[PDB]
Amino acid sequence: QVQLKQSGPGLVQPSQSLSITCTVSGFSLTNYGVHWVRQSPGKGLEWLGVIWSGGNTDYNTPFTSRLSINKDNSKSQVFFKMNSLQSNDTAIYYCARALTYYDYEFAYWGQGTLVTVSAASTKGPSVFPLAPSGGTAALGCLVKDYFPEPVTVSWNSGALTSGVHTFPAVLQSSGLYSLSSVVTVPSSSLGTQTYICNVNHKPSNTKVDKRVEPKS
Amino acid sequence: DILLTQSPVILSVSPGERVSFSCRASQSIGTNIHWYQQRTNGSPRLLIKYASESISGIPSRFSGSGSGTDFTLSINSVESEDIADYYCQQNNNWPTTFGAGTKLELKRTVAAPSVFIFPPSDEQLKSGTASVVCLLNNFYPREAKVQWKVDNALQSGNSQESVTEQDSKDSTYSLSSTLTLSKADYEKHKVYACEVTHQGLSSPVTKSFNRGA
């Protein structure tokens, strides 16, 4: 199983540096290069650079002065660092591996790291119930006032997926995000089945498990 | 660098149809083009390499063709699970570059929303703010109008909407509208209503609650 797992998302202050770790498994860094790609609103998909199996690096020309990539073969870790970030460096950053040691067809991707460049402060969410009261009931969790993105929401520790909708976050006029996650269930299940929304805001290490049930 | 032009920008199609994505390079790149799919909240997924070569694990309905400057990604019988963005990539010339993407949208029959309203929790109220939420579930098309009325006064400027991407199983949308009020304003009024208009509704649907009931 070839896998690439990246470090978690978070905030970088303007003019400061971004560091991401890519831990690989199922192959050796002595046999394959690892590439870095980012995806931004302003420029879409953009290849940033590569560290080859032998340690050489190539960087895309606009980044040669502020990018450095290193690795530890023995730890299966690749280290990405980019200096002097500005607001428009906000993007999803990926590591990726090609099919062949020398090529650029990216068959394997990390899960991506959302990097937000902002002078603001990290803040964890409050989690409030959206409490129910045709035969189908809707319930949910309101995940309010957090920064930066993202938050993950699951229901019943991932066991409940059918009928779940987790909406895109909205930026409120306060500069903080909010989102809701909802699920529809049989109304006769509200007495005996427990419904828990599991909220994780990794930038602030805030985890909340919130039971949602009809109110008295 | 090589510029890649993808067209159309939005590709709207009916399920079961054959669909074709265009990727055109600013100069000849031989067959050095690769294609990727990106689903909601996902990482890019390699579909086709070197214009036409298949990738292990990718459904057989995906294929590719072309050489020189004009390239085509094809899905021979599109499914709801194909809702995604599609990107081409060239690597005939350093540095490798990507196209801007084509968004694939799927047509389906009209479906009216199911509407649900949620009052603020007492937990939130002791923070000084009230969020009232209106849910429109599993509807098509995406266009819908949600109007808030508080004691029959139309609210303007204090709500925000969020819409999901098209569902990969049934091609519908869902929408959440959040009305934000100070606790003081919330406690001064009684009737809270969400009124929904949509192509699949012959007349508007109103869901409401009375504060303190």
Partner: peptide, 12 residues
């Protein structure tokens, strides 16, 4: 369209 990092989808 424009890429939206909250959904990883093109927003048009």
């Amino acid at each position: 369209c424009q890429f939206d990092q909250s959904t990883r989808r093109l927003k048009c």
